[PDB]
């Protein structure tokens, strides 16, 4: 049970990190557009 709960915790962290990554990608594309 503790292990299954922990897996949920990890999965949620991975999901939140994915949102962050997608935000960094958007940012890079914005800059790239203005810089080139």
């Amino acid at each position: 049970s503790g292990i299954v709960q922990q897996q949920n915790n990890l999965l949620r962290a991975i999901e939140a990190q994915q949102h962050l990554l997608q935000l960094t990608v958007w940012g890079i594309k914005q800059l790239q557009a203005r810089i080139l």
Binding site: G2, Q6, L10, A13, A16, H19, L20, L23, G27
Partner: protein, 34 residues
């Protein structure tokens, strides 16, 4: 860009919380191994 900064701040806080919780759960699962 203003929204971008808002979301960055929001997800960063969320991750810090999740990492925190996971840390607590790791300790307790580690304890339980004994």
């Amino acid at each position: 860009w203003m929204e971008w900064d808002r979301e960055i701040n929001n997800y960063t806080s969320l991750i810090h919380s999740l990492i925190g919780e996971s840390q607590n759960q790791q300790e307790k699962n580690e304890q339980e191994l004994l």
